[PDB]
């Protein structure tokens, strides 16, 4: 694959139509906190309750990876691998 790293800052990627928005019940500050497919690292959430949503004209947002205020635990952005 190919994915731009966002080292030293937040991701902030705006989801595109069709793309998944990952939430983790355990890691997320709250239910608005999401991760894009570039960033979500399955290894961070092996023992966690995760769910995906699908971006539509009406379900939108930006990825919170590397926004320290949005997560209860250190994430290891997938792009860094
Ligand atoms: Zn992201
Ligand atoms: Zn990331
Ligand atoms: Zn998690």
Curated annotation (Swiss-Prot):
Annotated residues for binding of Zn(2+) 4: 49
Domain of life of the native organism: Eukaryota
Stated consequence of mutating residue 64 to N/E: Abolished ability to degrade proteins with type-1 N-degrons without affecting ability to degrade proteins with type-2 N-degrons
Zn finger region (UBR-type): 9-81
Residues holding Zn(2+) 1: 6, 39, 65, 77
Binding positions (Zn(2+) 3): 24, 27, 45, 48
Binding site for Zn(2+) 2: 11, 36, 39, 63
UniProt function note: Ubiquitin ligase protein which is a component of the N-end rule pathway. Recognizes and binds to proteins bearing specific N-terminal residues that are destabilizing according to the N-end rule, leading to their ubiquitination and subsequent degradation. Recognizes both type-1 and type-2 N-degrons, containing positively charged amino acids (Arg, Lys and His) and bulky and hydrophobic amino acids, respectively.
Family in the record: Belongs to the E3 ubiquitin-protein ligase UBR1-like family.
Complex and partners: Interacts with UBC2. Interacts with RPN2, RPT1 and RPT6 from the 26S proteasome.
Protein name (record): E3 ubiquitin-protein ligase UBR1
Organism this protein belongs to: Saccharomyces cerevisiae (strain ATCC 204508 / S288c) (Baker's yeast)
Residues of the full protein shown: 115 to 193 of 1950
């Amino acid at each position: 694959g190919s994915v731009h790293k966002h080292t030293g800052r937040n991701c902030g990627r705006k989801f595109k139509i069709g793309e998944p928005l990952y939430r983790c019940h355990e890691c997320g500050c709250d239910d608005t906190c999401v991760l894009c497919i570039h960033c979500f690292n399955p290894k961070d959430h092996v023992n966690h309750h995760v769910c995906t949503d699908i971006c539509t004209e009406f379900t939108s947002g930006i990825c919170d990876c590397g926004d320290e205020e949005a997560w209860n635990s250190p994430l290891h952005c997938k792009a860094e691998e």
